[PDB]
């Protein structure tokens, strides 16, 4: 059989193969044929965590697997190869989910992105169009086939994740601006376009798509059909338009309907020519604005909706809200306009099913902590495992090792339940504290590791009578010891050497 001991393995060869590998094969050489026999051992590796020990020569002489038994987990946690008598906390146990469910509304139509991204004409910046999109399945991967732009520019989300989220309403605004005024279509911008023609809010959640259109909006004589506002009494509020045309007055005297002194027309026409520089060529801009989930959702991508399961630790995806938990029936009285339910920590715990108007309650799956009770490794290798604060009827668990319950190895205390210890009626002094009036110890010989109830002290009863006294007739001199700490170590710490070292840039950065 394979020999006992340790012998580390050293690499030779690494190659950039970069192909699928699923199966392998071993070749043999046959002389000529002639009979032959071969033997070989094959094992499968798994993702594990090991604790390896290096001796003074630099060679690996020992290793401990961290998922074989509670003692090895304790050794890995303590980062030591020896464990002293006591009770330690090693890890936690959780229940893994079984399957996944997805619930999306009854949406069949396709969103009309074709009629927005090219219509042979775009409205002026001072009076920009606006189209509302709702009740359709949104496919944002086809937008690239309609306009010759380079890339998106999204602020609240990412362009590649737009096929998963499910919104309430979508809005599309389209116009034509100058080349160097594209940078003004952004939150917190100031300029002629920003505060007089088109203003974006400071908390924008959407995308901007701008592309050059010099081959359609330019004429040799000069395009004069695109106008913009120049004068205005006050700045614009977010998402507001102005259409009114009048004679702006820059003087005290009234204009009286004539563009005379201190009287102008606040509608200047762009001059577009094909011989202009890049910064002056016309640019077509379309802004998509998303509304987050507050009302029933109406717009989102093509995700299939699966079956609904209950009373199982399962993964859920309700209208882009993803999580894991146990879904049960609800006694909550949701109002017609409500769709979610929140708790003290501000996390969702009651949801409404998009397809059938029904309310479900979410509870996190069972979990808890594990403690390992062991005597010193110098004594024995046996341990007991205490699941803390769990009715011992619950016990795909997170820990790799699994426990098997026999008749008498499982005990239930007021601090959880204990696996691997035998209960006795005797009462000794406490050895390894466990919980409320329970202790554990190691027997001479799960038969080992007994768990009992601690004993307060030896029983006594002094005879009392109202005409009797007890007087001593001898003495004893005793000498006892008492140990008290007085002082501790005096240390000093240097900042610059500890934080930066001999570096000069780090010290300059730290100086401020």
């Amino acid at each position: 059989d394979l020999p006992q001991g340790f012998s580390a393995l050293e690499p030779l060869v690494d190659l950039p193969i970069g192909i699928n590998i699923t199966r392998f094969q071993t070749l043999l050489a046959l002389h000529r044929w002639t009979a032959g026999a071969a033997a070989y051992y094959v094992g499968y590796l798994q993702p594990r965590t090991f604790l390896l020990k290096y001796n003074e020569n630099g060679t690996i002489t020992d290793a401990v697997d961290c998922a074989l038994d509670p003692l090895s987990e304790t050794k890995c946690t303590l980062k030591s190869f020896t464990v002293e008598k006591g009770i330690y906390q090693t890890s936690n146990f959780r229940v893994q989910p079984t399957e996944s469910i997805v619930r999306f509304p009854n949406i069949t139509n396709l969103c009309p992105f074709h009629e927005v991204f090219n219509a042979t004409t775009f409205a002026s910046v001072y009076a920009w169009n606006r189209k509302r999109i709702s009740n359709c399945v949104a496919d944002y991967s086809v937008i690239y086939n309609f306009a010759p732009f380079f890339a998106f520019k999204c602020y609240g989300v990412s362009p590649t994740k737009l096929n998963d989220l499910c919104f309430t309403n979508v809005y599309a605004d389209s116009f034509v601006i100058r080349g160097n005024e594209v940078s003004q279509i952004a939150p917190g911008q100031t300029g002629n376009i920003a505060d007089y023609n088109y203003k974006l809010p400071d908390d924008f959640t959407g995308c901007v798509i701008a592309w050059n259109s010099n081959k359609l909006d330019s004429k040799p004589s000069g395009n004069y059909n695109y106008l913009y506002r120049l004068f205005r009494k006050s700045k614009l509020k977010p998402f507001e338009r102005d259409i009114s045309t009048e004679i702006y007055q820059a003087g005290n005297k009234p204009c009286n309907g004539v563009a005379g002194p201190n009287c102008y027309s606040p509608l200047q026409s762009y001059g577009f020519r094909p011989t202009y520089g890049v910064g002056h060529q016309p640019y077509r801009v379309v802004v998509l604005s998303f509304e987050l989930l507050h009302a029933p959702a109406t717009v989102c991508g093509p995700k299939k909706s699966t079956n609904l399961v209950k009373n199982k630790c399962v993964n859920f995806n309700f209208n882009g809200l993803t999580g894991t938990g146990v879904l049960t029936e609800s006694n909550k009285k949701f109002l017609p306009f409500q769709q979610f339910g929140r708790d003290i920590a501000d996390t969702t715990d009651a949801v409404r099913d998009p397809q059938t108007l029904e309310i479900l309650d979410i509870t996190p799956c069972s979990f808890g902590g594990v403690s390992v009770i062991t005597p010193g490794t110098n004594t024995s290798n046996q341990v007991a495992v205490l699941y803390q604060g769990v009715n011992c009827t619950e016990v795909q668990l997170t820990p790799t090792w699994r426990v098997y319950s026999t008749g008498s190895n499982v005990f239930q205390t007021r601090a959880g339940c204990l696996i691997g210890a035998e209960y006795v009626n005797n009462s000794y002094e406490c050895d390894i504290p466990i919980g409320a009036g329970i202790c554990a110890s190691y027997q001479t010989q799960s038969q080992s590791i007994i768990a009992y109830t601690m004993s307060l002290g030896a029983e006594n009863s002094v005879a009392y009578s109202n005409n009797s006294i007890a007087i001593p007739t001898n003495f004893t001199i005793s000498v006892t010891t008492e140990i008290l700490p007085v002082s501790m170590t005096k240390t000093s710490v240097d900042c610059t050497m500890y934080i930066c070292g001999d570096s000069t840039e780090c010290s300059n950065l730290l100086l401020q």
Partner: nanobody, 114 residues
Framework: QVQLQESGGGLVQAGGSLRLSCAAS????????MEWYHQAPGKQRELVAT???????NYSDSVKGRFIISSDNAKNSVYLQMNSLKDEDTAVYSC????????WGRGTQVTVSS
């Protein structure tokens, strides 16, 4: 779910042979120990045979030269080959295995007629 189950007990005349087949539900390559105990009525249990992970095998005084203990790797099981039965071998037999916590079998009755 139960760790170990034994089967093979019954009525056998003196001088015969029998086979006990304590089968485990976990890979026996990490159990580190398989032990056989026998309890006869009126007395306590006494050690019979012991096999450890490495391969060393041990028996008590009333075992050597009579019956042996082995194990195969095709099926998780430990076999005891009772031979040369006599009167006091009538007992209930249990198998025990400890990896980090002792697991005990149910036990089976073995009776020899003399």
């Amino acid at each position: 779910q139960v760790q170990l189950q034994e089967s093979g007990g019954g009525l056998v005349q003196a001088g015969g042979s029998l086979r006990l087949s304590c089968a485990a539900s976990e890979s026996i390559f990490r159990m580190e120990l398989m032990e056989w105990y026998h309890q006869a009525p009126g007395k306590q249990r006494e050690l019979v045979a012991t096999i450890n992970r490495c391969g060393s095998t041990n028996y008590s005084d009333s075992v050597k030269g009579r019956f042996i203990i082995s194990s195969d790797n095709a099926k998780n099981s430990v076999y005891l080959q009772m031979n040369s039965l006599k009167d006091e071998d009538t007992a209930v037999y249990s198998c025990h295995a400890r990896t980090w916590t002792s697991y005990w079998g149910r036990g089976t009755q073995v009776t020899v007629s003399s």
